[PDB]
Design a protein around this ligand. Structure first.
Ligand SMILES: Nc1ncnc2c1ncn2[C@@H]1O[C@H](COP(=O)(O)OP(=O)(O)OP(O)(O)=S)[C@@H](O)[C@H]1O
Ligand SMILES: [Mg+2]
Lengths: 602, 411, 99, 99, 87
């Protein structure tokens, strides 16, 4: 029934229609004849004038006719969007506007394909379209990467899963064997999505996982002073800068580096230098492995930092720890190769286990190590011109504040302003758009809008969108979970898609302690003396897929999903073999074994 | 039959209905819902007032959520209504369904304003991990409400191994908890060096501070025979450590209280900071043990916070509270903010509280700030704050499917 | 909508092309001398190339399709194309050179 | 015409007297369900003291002449009488007391 | 609001003027019967910033003091004026 009615008003860019009849909820799938955002078309002579439903009801009737017919409302307002070629292509803009009394039809599957489908090789699939069957949402990949992105919505909207879906579909070895992406995971949930297909760096590594180490000498002077001391400004700063210079010159005299000499040596130069010698020498004047010995207070502060397991990813790097003689097992080559040259495309620097006080100044540093490294080798086969990079940032509204005075804002602004030339992207996952600096959100290319409850942030989004289309933006606060409105220059026209959820078992979940589980189980007496013996020294030391075996230490070992290792002590080994032979996993362990014996997770 | 009128205008997220608070719109096989946003002569189209400004039968309604085939009720809609549709009035089964949830993570805290049968379920997991917040007024009687919450989520019926702490000042909760909860000795050597200098000596500045640190260092060393300075090892007043920990966290009783009425107002901020830091540090190191926060999460609640979380308060308490707000999520540590005057609590902290309970609010400054520090909002949740009945509360946050109006009662 | 209004009002001529969002359209109408009802309503759907030229440089407002420059004489920026670069099979790299 | 219609609606019984302006007759007749052309068209020629009562306090609306209270009980503000106070001969006064 | 009925009832009613005569009553509306918002509006003008909070709190001390010695309860402006103006 490809027919609706006859255009009665024509304002050039705002036509109106008079619906003729009855609305039927087509069963099987549920697609009605006409919705609020549904497309319409108008054959004119030989070409097609397509439009979008802008308003439905009494808001579309020509104004003065309300006086004529106060309670008669059967009109629609359609805003005409583009046009189809003569069997050539769909292009925006109109070669010739319609007149009164024309014919107005409804969009059919061939038109779905013509409008939505395309032939360029860049476009890829990121979930099918909503309100119609089997139409993949095609997003230009080149533009999305080089023109920067963003995600916005409400807390429960589900932006982490959309980002996971995009990363999964953008790095498959089938078509993009040499992809490259970096994610500044914060809450620490993506790491569960890509079990055996991405590299993950933590602060407390597991048996089969890496340790995030950022050598303290890969920093500039300002960044290093900011992280260590808080940004001194007196003569103490001068003294420390001179000491760093002296240490670097000394090590260069000790060891040779390609094409660096005393004439081209600066503090910014990333070469090894021993922090411990610096501290010990600057403290002796006011009075190594072990830290037993007018910038005194700074030196007590740094001394406290030295012997602190929290700061084990800076001063006690696994193998980037530098000897007294400025000698290290490995140079920055291995670090760069692991971060960006590894065999796995995507890498995740989950920063959950970081002192929040420094988190911002940490983010910036990484963004400065990467860009500065991919800028001075832009002609080699390992730069951004030959294998571009995409950076992801989770919870961006805390660091990119309009008035924030941190360093991360500078790095992100620099990537946005200058990343086009050297192929560097950016993806800002956020939750409160109005917080983000309006100068940066206006330079992001594409926008994945989602559900937005606050009226104070919807207005911001509407006011900062390149194509403020209203047929698809009057429905912001009602979208489904995963229903995304894509608007930008990375797509030919606005899209209203649903993102194909990732398959079960491949999803993000920050392993929060479920209070219900940890409070329902029966109380068991605690060994608080263990708590004290563990705190004095400042140290930490359903389904079942394997069970450990040992009959000499009187201990049991079990492994759950997500790589959870449990060691149960004071367990007679007779019960060990009983359980092993029982062939009852999840039930016998439930029976009288959950809360009988002591156990300490490792 | 129940009926109101017919839909006569749509723009996606805002509907107008012409007549012959929740509302439900049927579509067949599915049920849309919504709330009346604007009512009265102002709801009519902009230029339709001129034609007829005295005949008002238009109601503006905002779509809110959808309900499937007796499966669940989820926000946002997959379809929309079109001219010619019908509108009903919410009935008892409708409330029974939209507020009824089958997830085991929901706990009952009361009932609805109109209906008493259906409980006012709240997701405790998020309420604890994400964070909490209670904003009230002097005449709202927040004490009874918060007491009901605390002794309703902590009953030994289903959570025998709970663990809560209250930093009460006025001591009013001592009477409320007769014997169903504990009631209350901070050693002078457990606390860190700098806090000890601040509390007792008055914050010495000159080289006497260095000399005193030195002396405490050697006294600390000589204690060992009969390494670091800050070690919490006793050295040579009861108030001016496994047993103390168990009394604080290891006690058989589920809840515990700390009445600090008698102590001076000057040092009380430093004392709350010291206590919160001690608890957090202990439960951060004990992560990988049965005593840790990963195996028995702890919740901290403090009232009269509006004098401690000020915009630019310089006390040590703010630092520890911020640490809990940011990093405390990972280690299974919660927090609950009770305050009868929230205009003073900084926005940058009140903006991180996931769940918000609102009570009788009269002044305009508070009413503006609460709206300015909320992640969700509905038009039918702003003009009724000052008229709330004592004992009622408005729940808005991510720990509830939809914002609610509920009465809290003891079990 | 971002250009300073006082400066934008002192430009004699305008080439109003396609204009999408509802704010810049109004801000352009707010600084155009010969606001002309017939042609200014069709602003948001001018094709790729069309340009409504309004000002004193023309006797009467036009609606002109700018004549495209010949192929090869087009503006282009040699930015990388990630889809054609990420597809090439990875080649072992030595990062001693980058460092 | 200006009073709030929201608070006027709930009122039960209404007294209406002579009305002259044409903007108020519409509001008053829009405040009554008993839309009678006679009951709101004879309005603008009602003598002083006449009035029409419409509502549930009266069995049937109709027009009546309200009797005046007797001489000596009749509301009136004691505003100055300019004609009488300006007719009398000018009296020399001293403003020192006024200051 | 025009003093026009006083003559209607020569002796059948009682009037409450604002500047009465020897043989007539005086209207008296004790301020303290007012509620907080009303009092602030009448005396100050409905301030919002710190001043509103300061005055709202200030009323409370005097109200509770009067109550403990013996919400619509009597209290004195003059003491308020002197106390928080002397500050
Ligand atoms: N497209 C989707 N369809 C259905 N459910 C989804 C979808 N995406 C996410 N979810 C689910 O909705 C819940 C929350 O979604 P998440 O993306 O995992 O968390 P999130 O709140 O969006 O991330 P934060 O905290 O805002 S950074 C989870 O139960 C998801 O499984
Ligand atoms: Mg997330």
């Amino acid at each position: 029934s490809t027919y609706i009615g006859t255009v009665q008003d024509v304002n050039g860019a705002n036509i109106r229609v008079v619906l003729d009849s009855s609305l039927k909820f087509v069963d099987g799938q549920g697609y009605r004849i006409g919705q609020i955002g549904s497309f319409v078309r108008i054959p004119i002579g030989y070409i097609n004038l397509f439009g979008i439903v802008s308003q439905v009801g009494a808001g579309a009737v020509p104004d003065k006719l309300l006086e004529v017919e106060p309670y008669g409302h059967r009109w629609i307002s359609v805003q005409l969007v583009g046009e189809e070629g003569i069997k050539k292509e769909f292009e925006r803009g109109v070669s010739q506007y319609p007149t009164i009394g024309d014919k107005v039809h409804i969009v059919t599957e061939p038109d779905l394909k013509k409008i939505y489908g395309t032939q360029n090789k860049k476009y890829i699939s990121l979930g099918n379209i909503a309100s119609v069957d089997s139409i993949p949402a095609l997003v230009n990949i080149d533009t999305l990467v080089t023109r920067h992105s963003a995600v916005l919505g409400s807390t429960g909207s589900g932006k982490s899963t959309t980002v996971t879906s995009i990363l999964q579909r953008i790095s498959d070895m089938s078509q993009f064997p040499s992809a490259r992406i970096i994610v500044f995971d914060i809450h620490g949930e993506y790491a569960a999505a890509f079990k055996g297909k991405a590299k993950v760096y933590k602060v407390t590594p597991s048996n089969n996982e890496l340790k995030l180490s950022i050598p303290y000498w890969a920093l500039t002077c300002d960044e290093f002073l900011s992280v260590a001391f808080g940004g001194l400004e007196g003569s103490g700063r001068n003294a420390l800068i001179d000491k760093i210079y002296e240490l670097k010159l000394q090590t260069l005299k000790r060891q040779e580096y390609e094409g660096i000499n005393e004439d081209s040596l600066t503090v910014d130069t990333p070469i090894p230098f021993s922090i411990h010698k610096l501290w010990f020498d600057l403290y002796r004047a006011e009075i190594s492995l072990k830290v037993v010995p007018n910038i005194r207070k700074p030196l007590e502060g740094l001394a406290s930092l030295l012997k602190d397991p929290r700061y084990e990813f800076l001063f006690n790097a696994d193998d980037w720890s530098v000897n007294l003689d400025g000698k290290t097992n490995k140079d920055l080559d291995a670090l760069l190769e692991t971060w960006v040259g590894s065999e796995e495309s995507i890498s995740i620097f989950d920063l959950s286990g970081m002192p929040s006080s420094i988190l911002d100044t940490l983010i910036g540093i990484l963004i400065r190590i990467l860009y500065d490294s991919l800028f001075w080798s832009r002609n080699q086969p390992e730069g951004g011109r030959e294998r571009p990079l995409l950076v992801v940032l989770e919870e961006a509204h805390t660091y990119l504040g309009k008035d924030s005075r941190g360093i991360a804002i500078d790095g992100v602004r620099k990537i946005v302003k200058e990343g086009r030339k050297y192929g560097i992207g950016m993806m800002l996952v956020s939750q409160r758009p109005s917080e983000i600096d309006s100068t940066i959100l206006s330079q992001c290319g594409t926008l994945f809008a989602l559900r937005m409850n606050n009226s104070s942030d919807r207005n911001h989004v509407l006011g900062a969108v390149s194509d403020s289309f209203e047929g698809l933006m009057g429905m912001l606060p009602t979208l489904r979970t995963g229903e995304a409105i894509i608007i930008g220059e990375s797509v030919r026209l606005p899209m209203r898609t649903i993102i194909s959820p990732p398959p079960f078992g491949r999803r993000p979940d920050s392993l929060d302690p479920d209070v219900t589980a940890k409070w329902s189980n029966n109380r068991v007496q605690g060994d608080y003396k263990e708590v004290l013996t563990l705190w004095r020294q400042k140290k930490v030391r359903s389904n079942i897929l394997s069970i450990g075996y040992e009959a000499d230490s009187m201990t049991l070992e079990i492994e759950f999903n997500h790589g959870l290792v449990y060691q149960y002590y004071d367990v007679p080994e007779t019960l060990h073999t009983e359980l092993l032979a029982a062939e009852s996993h999840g039930k016998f362990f439930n029976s009288q074994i959950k809360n009988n014996y002591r156990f300490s997770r490792i």
